[model samples]
Target chain A: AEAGITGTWYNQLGSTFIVTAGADGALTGTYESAVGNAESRYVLTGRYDSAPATDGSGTALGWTVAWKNNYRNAHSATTWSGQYVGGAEARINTQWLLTSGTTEANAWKSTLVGHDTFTKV
Target chain B: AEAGITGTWYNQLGSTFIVTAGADGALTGTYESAVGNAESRYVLTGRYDSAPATDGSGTALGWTVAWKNNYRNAHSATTWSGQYVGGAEARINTQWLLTSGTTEANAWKSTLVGHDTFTKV
Candidate 1:
């Protein structure tokens, strides 16, 4: 194992992106599509294994991610996270999270719709 | 107040169900179907913030649920739980979570298939 370079790359694997909760408690988003590539919007089941600190000292996050618009259109897990907001509704929001290790997943298929992770920084 | 009914109820909103994991590691199960307003099958993106108890004293679950066969059928976050089988695959599932307090959403439309959580959970 040599010293690995950390940077951005793309190919059949497009870019990885993120979705965050908005103040209104919705994961506001859009999907990027190329010709012949599948693209659409989504909403998801949001749950946290932990509460993001009630005293305003925490935010939740996760490592990798995926989304299923249908049975066929989907991507592998990519990572993302950001400042966690309290009390996740069916909708929650615009925050950010990134990949944990070096994993590759597509951007359009990686934005979360209805979940949140509260990490305390 | 009204001593708080600590059980289950059904209305236009219906009963909550869950899918969980197994020995070989996948959320293996089926839908409780009848004649129906609507019904079909589904897969969801799985994510978890914390690892379930190491010796396996835990299972992940959620509250208030929903599911959509097309844009029609669904359930609310009904609580359920079970054991874990690690390394969530695209086919990952068969455990549970419960409704947090008192609210609801339909399933199908609620299940996120493609993007982040782990999509890491």
Candidate 2:
């Protein structure tokens, strides 16, 4: 039964996110109005695992989420290192950066960070 | 009398930022423990002018603050669009992104937005 973090979530700012988790711990979803804009859409991609607990639980268990905007040729987006905290909710910390030709090799374009919480709806 | 925004400012999270404005409206400064890291130091660069009020203030007036990290080859930093709200305080919005070989061009590495209030010290 897929019952850990598969569903729709509403962000604090009224944006809607739909999460679909795969059996292999891979997860994909779409974020509506991502990045605080009420009309921007972005793709949500990431994975879940428990081999390395990122929270220091002595295990590897967490989600690495990435936000990609196709409209801008993925020229700008954000990546998050977070984990599922049970109870249909997830908390993620993000680092927003630019890329070089869509690759991760980049520089101090801007190291913007923020906290976000998604409540499953 | 450099009093509009030429002084030390403290962010909401207790980080100390010092801004020095040049005679030509060019501003430079340093941010201590920037980007949520207490041990990280970053260079603060940008400009101030009345030709553009990012907040739509009819008058061109605002500060364009950019955070650059030399230690990391400027691998990561942040930029802010802000304005003085008078009374020893200023507010700004930020967009964090990565760069292609330190240049600002790439994919949706991430689009993280945040609001910050800096109080002059």
Candidate 3:
């Protein structure tokens, strides 16, 4: 019951993430942004753990995309932290942090935060 | 060589995190905290991506430790978001967040902010 996160998922904004999982705890994927003028699909690397928790819940899943590849102007990357809630209607609830490329000034404006409840497609 | 995070790491606080990486991008680890009276080595789940970026930098890494098991009185989990900077003395520089256990009262007090730089051990 620990293997349910290997597939395609979509966020609320219609962005797509095609993820693959290995038994040894690897995660590979592509993130095609639905945002305005994003011309290419970003490659993602991260880990997916399928081990159950003490509450009988599922494992943790996270991935990062260096958007600078797609947009050379983009100087930062995005990282996601969330849980893999597996079920008939499986979901991935995650908090996304887009690191700012600007000078390291303060926490308030240096980082932008977002979240999504991604559902499989 | 898109793999190097599968090993043991010790933070500045003397905490230990034993991590493993799968070819498919899965991450599993054990976090032994040096906090007071905490006798448990908490189990952690997350992903480790060792792929190189456009600038030849390394992949992203993050892990979550549900601390409720170790401290039954606790009500939060810690999620680490960082980069896997590999080299002679590789390091994991991460930002940690211990999510709020109580009602959403305030931003600063409700959530705990922390950081950890884990060096290979």
Candidate 4:
């Protein structure tokens, strides 16, 4: 298996931002604009698990995460029901699912479309 | 399915920026400050899939996520190794094992403690 598949994830959609996965079981990442007056971050405070397929030949498995207080972007205050698909070595192909929040903040239902490829050093 | 379900997600305190999940699964979200000096958040790129929103009713199935560049407050330049306590989730709930720095920036390996909830509109 890859040594470490967890760390600070970043991308340049417009500028640059951050999301620090703390130790208290809370995923809080953020992004900044211009001078920081307009910054954005979300905290997935709840539970999660990485299921690695034990079939030797790893296949696209699933990632499970339950957000207790899903808030951010729209400053959305909600609870999320979502999950991912893939193993730490599954060539980075997957998706996510979210179920139910309190408002129209993509809170209750949503999907995360992205490819995550991990490298072991 | 939630009709114009696209909007901003917000919480309670701090500088609240914005995060609009464009028609593209490039789930882009951000958070800023009073002076806009610093912000945080992360993104999952590539592809995704969502089941139902599902079924003939609901029963809190499961939530999962896979971060491409999982990161955070350690703006000191580092990574993380961890998961969370729920969904819409964060990296390590409370023990982000950052692989290595590109140094002693707690780039990984840690946990969290506080709890923040949400109230949707």
Among these predictions, the greatest DockQ belongs to: 3
User: Which ranges in model 1 have alpha carbons more than 4 Å from their true place?
Assistant: A1-38, A49-55, A61-65, A85-121, B1-121
Candidate with the greatest TM-score versus the true structure: 3
lDDT against the true structure, per candidate, is 0.25, 0.51, 0.61, 0.25
Tens digit per residue, CA lDDT, model 4, B1-121: 1212123333344433233333322223333332211244432211111123322221121212222224332211111111111234211111111111111122123212122222222
Q: Candidate 4: RMSD over Cα atoms?
A: 16.5
For this target, which candidate reaches the highest lDDT against the unseen true structure? 3
What 10-residue stretch in candidate 3 chain A is worst by lDDT?
Answer: A99-108
- Real contacts retained, model 2: 0.15
lDDT by residue (B30-50, candidate 2, tens digit) is: 777544322556667777663
Evaluated on the second chain alone, the candidates' TM-scores are 0.27, 0.62, 0.83, 0.35
List the candidate 3 regions with Cα displacement exceeding 4 Å: A36-38, A52-56, A70-73, A106-108, B1-11, B15-79, B82-94, B97-113, B117-121
DockQ per candidate: 0.04, 0.11, 0.12, 0.05
- What lDDT score goes with residue B50 in model 1? 29
Error of 2 at A53 (Å): 55
lDDT of 3 by residue, B1-121 (tens): 1257888889988899887877755566678888633446766766544433455454555566655342442434566766666778777767765543332133225345567788987
Tens digits of per-residue lDDT, candidate 1, B55-78, equal 422222212122323443322222
Clashes of each: 70, 35, 9, 101
TM-score for each model: 0.24, 0.39, 0.57, 0.28
Ranking by TM-score: 3, 2, 4, 1
